[PDB]
Design a protein. Structure first.
Lengths: 260, 260
């Protein structure tokens, strides 16, 4: 069917999914954007309803795969959207439960441990970097929301295929301990250059969120603390840039590059 | 003195510096943030007026160094600021006159050439990365505004110390030919991995602005085209992340690292 009024109860229900509490209550979440919807589908998430705006393309209908297709008016679409200018393709997906239970890591795994709550902008950028480098696992803080409109948007949907899990620090520590993997703490005060670390057999990088920084306890127990060199006026890099540099250095060594 | 009303004439004039048009007309620009003001001062920029918010520190007054010190109400500060949460220290500086003609590079220069008009946010982030890697020079497009609040904030004020020059394509080409810089074009389809380039003897990286492509004339000219591996879903990284990866790879090789 097609819904005209932004006051229609279905539209109100869809708009309510902007809130985390409503996503948890309903077990549903909204994915906005043609690209983001394709990414969620590819990742194996279950589509319940496809939403199409007035400027949707005929190809967008093929994304439904049997799900309900709901057409929205311009005004109805604007109510449901979290964007300045709404995407013309959106999907209502089942909110999956994520858990490290039984998760196994491949050989010489590249792991990023992001300590502390992170802002959605940074978080999206970090996930994109992890996606690019082919990280085997990303651990984030226990309360991190990976299904918010902002994280989905800022990661361009990279969040969906990535092995990323919100976990308490205690659980994370115990999980990492089970593997023969070095803990490498990133910090501008690190004693070694990050190029000097040996990541050829895998690595779990420890990286603090932007405003929290690396917790002293994690810095202490790391096998090595590494810095990215700063050669100008700035005392530190953005957290996502830091994450990319670390992951791509591990990738360089996996690709045959020698530690410095 | 202390100014209370956001409608005070001084406040309106200060708030008017939010437009490039008014900055050019007055030869003045606003630098917001204690850190950014200090770094502007370090760079030798001339401070005309120090602005102090109600919650400024007594230690902030020392920044004035002979300049007029104007105190603002929370109300008045909010109108001058470009932030939701205004910094309590701001500075009105004189616009400097900068020319590429008076620039000489080191023995094995690290140069970034950013082609096309770039969003102010991305630009500041690129400059922060360039400063960290210790780039000798960054060339940007002719119309690029380096004194916008966004470039200042996202560079954490590193824009002030970093050698950055807005130049037309002809002037950039002239500079590069004259300094005999090897041109390496960064593109996702590059024939070589960016680790496979030899940057030990200096390099100018050619990088297209976000969403903008890399001009075929520049791409063709380059000695080599290199890509950053993308092992996940996405096909490209954010421009500031790309810039950081390229520049720090060059720095790795300068620091004793060999090409892949
Ligand atoms: N040059 C650097 N070396 C190592 N870690 C860094 C560097 N710059 C920023 N970080 C890290 O990035 C995050 C953002 O401040 C923090 O966890 C911080 O420790
Ligand atoms: N994987 C990559 N390799 C080389 N350049 C890239 C890569 N990803 C993005 N870029 C560049 O970064 C900018 C942002 O799209 C463009 O100049 C683009 O060419
Ligand atoms: K529920």
């Amino acid at each position: 069917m097609r819904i005209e009024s932004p006051q229609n109860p279905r539209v109100k229900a869809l708009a309510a999914l902007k809130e985390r509490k409503e996503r948890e209550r309903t077990g549903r979440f909204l994915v906005e954007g043609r690209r983001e919807v394709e990414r969620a589908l590819e990742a194996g998430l279950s589509l319940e309803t496809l939403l199409l705006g007035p400027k949707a393309r005929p190809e967008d209908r093929a994304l439904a795969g049997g799900a309900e297709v709901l057409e929205l008016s311009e005004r109805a679409l604007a109510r449901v959207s979290t964007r300045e200018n709404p995407a013309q393709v959106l999907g209502v997906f089942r909110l999956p439960r994520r858990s490290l239970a039984g998760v196994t890591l491949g050989a010489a795994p590249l792991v990023l441990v992001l300590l502390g709550l992170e802002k959605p902008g940074n978080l999206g950028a970090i996930l994109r970097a992890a996606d690019g480098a082919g990280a085997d696992l990303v651990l984030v803080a226990e309360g991190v929301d990976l299904f918010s409109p902002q994280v989905i948007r800022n990661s361009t949907g990279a969040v969906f295929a990535l092995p990323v899990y919100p976990v308490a620090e205690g659980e994370a520590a115990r999980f990492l301990e089970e593997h023969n993997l070095p803990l490498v703490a990133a910090t501008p005060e690190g004693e070694r250059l990050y190029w000097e670390g040996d990541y050829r057999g895998g690595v779990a990088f420890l990286l603090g969120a932007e405003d929290k920084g690396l917790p002293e306890a994690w810095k202490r127990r790391a096998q090595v603390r590494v810095r990215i060199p700063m050669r100008g006026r700035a005392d530190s890099l953005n957290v996502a840039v830091t994450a990319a540099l670390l992951l791509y250095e591990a990738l360089r060594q996996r690709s045959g590059g020698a530690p410095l």
